[PDB]
Ligand binder design. Structure first.
Ligand SMILES: CCCCCCCCCCCCO
Ligand SMILES: CCCCCCCCCCCCO
Ligand SMILES: [Zn+2]
Ligand SMILES: [Zn+2]
Ligand SMILES: [Zn+2]
Ligand SMILES: [Zn+2]
Lengths: 630, 630
């Protein structure tokens, strides 16, 4: 069968254990999530200009009765329902948020003559919808300032839904961001982007239905709205430790926390309302030190210290703490306790992972040994809905010691598809393997089953009996999973094992923000080494609009670029505005028209740039993950 | 049997293949390594003040005839012999090096009135021995300036063998380093230090004899001298991009390359001799993007660009290039070609790893797919003696995508000791497993054997037949290994499987260089969470000599420290000079004597600091690696 199966007796037992172990009697979040509600629109259906749907919430109606479903981890089901508390809310005097219009929240702070807005959602249509709700309930005001709390797309993505370049150019609107914003907004998504985006189909469960045996939540929100990605450059940067500014009569203290949840990030303290906006440093979950879709590892230590710094500066005196995801927390004692526990959560993960590592516990063991102490374990905002204790501990370890467990048995490993046939042969052939795996499956040993049956799938990818058993076991693990990313991954893997990978199949703002060096670095990543072999060429590239020059050198099957250097011996010198190069790579203009408009100029050998571009390859999106390359 | 076995017919075949595939007819390095030889002392035996031996070379006599030994990869054997070309050499007019007195080289540059010395070896006795050889052959001169090329112990470790603090304090001697030196010298060795040092016993093969079936070389040198680690703070830092200075009449151009082989590193150009000293950016091997002992991953991209920057600034005009490890290369065309190929080597590894990753190739596959192009493959200085193509490719991948392969079968893995019993049961029990593994072994399938028999060892660690077969297969892989670290790891693992882990079992300068925040971070890593559970305490710590204050807070089984903060509600306030705290942790003084000298003062509850220290645990050095914890 290729449809989801019911939860097994073991999965059911696992859900009852969760209820036994976690403080469900602490229901305070349900009152917190509804506090200050001004309007929850009856439905939410947000549409893009091209007619697609940006966002949605009706697919989540199954969650509304609050009835526990054994195909959902009851802790995750609690979070899933809390994330359904959407609409326009009051946080404090003159501070509002729109939650559940997208993955993130959008915040509106009343200035004397209009709004200061913190963050802008993922896509213009969701930001625009949030702004329309605000205007309907609170009266229309102009937006005078937009603040990006940090350099992630679920925060800057929707800016064009709120403001247009002409307003930024007139000085009608300011855009404020932490120093480092523009680099950080783009960099981490580029060089390994195709890998990350494909792997993210698992994390986000993009092929799963919304429902009890599909996608149910995404921890820091319901999921991510779909539509155009926009981005407008900051007009003012908050530098150094932070800054105190007054915006439209309202005092703001900005505290930079670079290198925590994002390389460019800042907390916001509002002294008049005693309101502490913790950016994405403190949300209603354990966050990722390592995003499963693939990314650099984050620094739990700095993360912990910056929360401590915010505690000692503001926690002190805060009457409400709130954030760019999830709901606020009111009352000084509560705020102090949340700050301490989150400081100690990232600190414990860091320190105790290292403590174990220093005792010989490896990257292949640490998640099965490290456990939070009761005081940290027993808070809802410490649960692993988004990050997990397990995958965070391995990330800390990977950060300090790397991927290699120190045992040379594992130093030069055969690819899984190359050892798989022998594992199957040693276990008696596929039928014998299946027979023993089915018995293990019947004992509820799903974490073992998915490991060993994965061998048979990699050896025999067209063995439907193996794919089906492996899917079944993954699905049970997904049902059991507290972490929304783990759930979506397990169910996505089960889906592809059962059905196969899909065979049927801008952003201009994002490209414009990309540094030219990084762009060239990306082109080097696209280079087909087979095509490049034995070639050598060099091109002086001049970009007059941005006043940069690059020297491009292809040699030894590698593309180099160097800023600020030109070579008297380059084979060709090309001049093109960066704006026009961008139009080229986005196919908004032809090379030929550009030459004819005198917008692309060349001296030397006219053919080299075309030769170089002719060597650049492309990446297919839907690569195989749960089987070897087909 | 528990003694090394001869190379198998397959290993022998593997060595003949190496000879077929690599340009052994290119013997130019042998003339390069002997060029400018002034004196090769007949023996080298260097002793420490405590009577130990620092260094070694007589144990390498087996290599001297140049006869190929089938238990050594012939490429590694070539390198091993080249690294035996030790003594005092002329590089250019007034530029000398002592090579083979330690892992690194020490360089002596003739000033008008004494020496400028670049780097200082690992330990004072080896630096002192190098200096004595210099004085014997070239005449005694004072050392007026010491330059640290970068922040690694094999470069700063021996400084006290050359100069003493009193000379630095009088201004008789200057010590020059790249900005960032003092942080970088210490930081990366602290938090996970016990893990790294134990794992390094494998990489360095510290338990192996010197000989054809033991340790033969360490790629960038013969091995590391053993003795006290010294460190003296720089008196002048090279900031920004670099600087041009004149030292004792000699012009120097310093080019910083932060974040390449070390976070603080600089190339040196000497315009009068047209001599280019490439720090540890370019040595006679592919270097590590990831050191197997365990470390953060390095940035191949920046590494590649900085070599390109040095090429375009100096390569241009260089008549000799030399380095802090291995031998020089003379002649402009040769220098230009080495710089290009090394730039493209790190660039190819970076770009092509990402190219593959973007196609779906995972961290578990990439090393079995990525291969250098011929132009890079066919140079001796590109061979993987120190770094490897294989482990570097996985590191690039780990850096961008992390440890997780995207396949949820592997998302929540059982520890090896917990799945091992089932692997053994599925394969028919230990005897059946051994039977099939011995047949695979007889086919020379050593990379498979070590994977599968490792399962049986982890299930049954006292199964001597399994340990013995696993050792045999690892040993063959070690014989075959071109990489000196891989060889030493494989033979070390074989040694422990056969014999067991050893059951019989300062640096004051290094501690003094450690930032106080990092020291406190380390103490938090030592915290026993079991002992800390349920406790809360806070201590204001004041360190008057360095004019720093810290707030220490223990809560939620985590130790926090915050620089520059004090709390009016701390339970205790302690004042102690940092110098004295250091003496305490190095047991050079008692807490009690310090109090009695008025060097440790307290107000508030006098017991808290002792309570905190009482919760701090210790790490055993000899943890198990090739078996589960005993
Ligand atoms: C194409 C795969 C669709 C999944 C969306 C993944 C993009 C994540 C960016 C938003 C989160 C920012 O931290
Ligand atoms: C205690 C284990 C002995 C092995 C020595 C490992 C220390 C490496 C430091 C020297 C290399 C600097 O990059
Ligand atoms: Zn974010
Ligand atoms: Zn976010
Ligand atoms: Zn080094
Ligand atoms: Zn070195």
């Amino acid at each position: 069968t290729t449809a989801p199966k019911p939860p097994s007796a073991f999965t059911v037992e696992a859900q009852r254990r969760v209820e036994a172990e976690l403080p469900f009697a602490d229901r305070a979040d349900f009152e917190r999530a509804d506090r200050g509600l001004i309007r929850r629109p009856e439905r939410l259906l947000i549409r893009n200009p091209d007619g697609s749907v940006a966002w949605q919430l009706g697919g989540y109606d199954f969650l509304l009765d609050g009835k526990p479903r054994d195909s959902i981890n009851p802790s995750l089901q609690r979070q899933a329902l809390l994330n359904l508390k959407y609409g326009l809310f009051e946080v404090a005097e003159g501070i509002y948020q729109v939650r559940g219009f997208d993955l993130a929240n959008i915040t509106f702070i009343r200035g004397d003559s209009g709004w200061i807005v913190v963050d802008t959602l993922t896509t213009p249509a969701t930001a625009r919808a949030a702004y329309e709700l605000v205007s309907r309930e609170l009266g229309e005001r102009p937006i005078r300032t937009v603040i990006y709390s940090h350099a992630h797309a679920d925060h800057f993505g929707g800016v064009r839904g709120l403001v247009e370049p002409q307003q930024v150019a007139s000085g009608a609107v300011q855009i404020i961001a932490p120093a480092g914003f523009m680099e950080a907004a783009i960099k981490e998504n580029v060089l390994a982007g195709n890998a990350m985006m494909r792997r993210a189909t698992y994390q986000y469960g993009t092929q799963l239905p919304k429902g009890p045996q599909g996608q149910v939540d995404m921890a820091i929100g319901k999921g991510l709205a779909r539509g155009p990605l926009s981005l407008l450059a900051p007009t003012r940067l908050i530098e150094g430790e932070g800054e105190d500014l007054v915006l439209d009569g309202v005092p703001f203290t900005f505290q930079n926390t670079p290198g925590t949840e994002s390389p460019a990030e800042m907390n916001i303290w509002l002294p008049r309302q005693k309101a502490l906006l913790m950016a994405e440093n403190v949300v209603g979950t354990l966050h990722n030190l390592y995003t499963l879709r693939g990314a650099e590892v984050r620094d739990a230590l700095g993360w912990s210290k910056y929360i401590n710094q915010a505690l000692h500066r503001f926690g002190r005196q805060a009457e409400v703490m709130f954030a760019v995801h999830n709901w606020p927390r009111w009352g000084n004692a509560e705020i102090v306790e949340v700050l301490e526990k989150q400081r100690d959560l990232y600190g414990y993960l860091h320190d105790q992972t290292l403590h174990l590592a220093n005792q010989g516990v490896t990257i292949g063991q640490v998640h099965n040994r490290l456990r939070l102490p009761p005081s940290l374990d027993q808070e809802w905002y410490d649960r692993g809905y988004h990050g997990s204790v397990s995958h965070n501990a391995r990330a800390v370890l990977n950060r300090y010691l790397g991927y290699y467990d120190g045992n040379p048995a594992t130093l030069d490993p055969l690819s899984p598809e190359d050892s798989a046939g022998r594992y199957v042969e040693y276990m008696g052939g596929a039928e014998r393997l299946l027979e023993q795996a089915r018995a293990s499956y019947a004992r509820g040993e799903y974490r073992w089953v998915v490991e060993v049956v994965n061998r048979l799938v990699f050896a025999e990818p067209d063995n439907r009996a193996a794919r089906e058993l492996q899917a079944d076991a993954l699905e049970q693990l997904g049902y059991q999973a507290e972490n929304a990313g783990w759930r979506n991954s397990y169910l996505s893997a089960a889906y592809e094992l059962r059905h196969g990978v899909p065979r049927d199949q801008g952003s201009a703002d994002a490209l414009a923000a990309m540094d030219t060096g990084l762009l060239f670095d990306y082109l080097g990543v696209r280079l087909d080494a087979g095509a490049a072999e034995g070639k050598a060429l060099s091109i002086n590239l001049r970009l007059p609009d941005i006043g940069e020059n690059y020297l491009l050198e292809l040699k030894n099957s590698h593309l180099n670029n160097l800023r600020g250097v030109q070579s008297e011996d380059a084979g060709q010198t090309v001049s093109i505005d960066r704006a026009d190069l961008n139009r080229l790579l986005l196919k908004e203009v032809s090379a030929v028209r550009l030459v004819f408009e005198g917008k692309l100029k060349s001296s030397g050998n006219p053919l080299l740039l075309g030769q170089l571009f002719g060597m650049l390859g492309d990446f297919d999106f839907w690569f195989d993950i749960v089987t070897p390359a087909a």
